Amino acid sequence: XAXVXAXV
Amino acid sequence: XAXVXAXV
DNA sequence: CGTACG
DNA sequence: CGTACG
Ligand SMILES: *C(=O)c1cnc2ccccc2n1
Ligand SMILES: *C(=O)c1cnc2ccccc2n1
Ligand SMILES: *C(=O)c1cnc2ccccc2n1
Ligand SMILES: *C(=O)c1cnc2ccccc2n1
């Protein structure tokens, strides 16, 4: 869920 | 210089 | 040069 | 799940 790299 | 990971 | 999550 | 610089 969290998006800090990919943004699942 | 720029710090986005390490911050040289 | 290496950090950053639910 | 993978991004982010001078
Ligand atoms: C988002 O909250 C989230 C949490 N755990 C994960 C594990 C693996 C792939 C994606 C994920 N996304
Ligand atoms: C994003 O590319 C990425 C990769 N590894 C991580 C590890 C821990 C937190 C966030 C992360 N984000
Ligand atoms: C900062 O601006 C900066 C620019 N280039 C680098 C190359 C290698 C190591 C650190 C660096 N820091
Ligand atoms: C910080 O850990 C890190 C690593 N690789 C990068 C590549 C491009 C831009 C910023 C980056 N930051």
In b/e form, how buried is each residue of A1-8, taking b as 16+ CB within 10 angstroms? Answer: eeeeeeee
Residue B6 CA to D5 C1' — how many Å? 9
Distance A5 CA to ligand 2 centre (A): 5
**Who's near B6: CB < 8 A, 6+ residues apart?**
none
Residue whose Cα lies nearest atom 4 of ligand 4: it is B5
DSSP 8-state assignment for residue B7: -
What resolution in angstroms does the PDB record give?
1.7
Chain B residues 1-8 with Cβ under 7 Å of strand D are 1-6, 8
Distance B4 CA to ligand 3 centre (A): 11
Among residues A6, A3, A5, the alpha carbon closest in space to that of B4 is found at A5
Size of chain B in residues:
8
C-alpha–C-alpha distance, residues B2 and A4, integer Å = 18
C-alpha–C-alpha distance, residues A7 and B8, integer Å = 27
C-alpha–C-alpha distance, residues A7 and B3, integer Å = 21
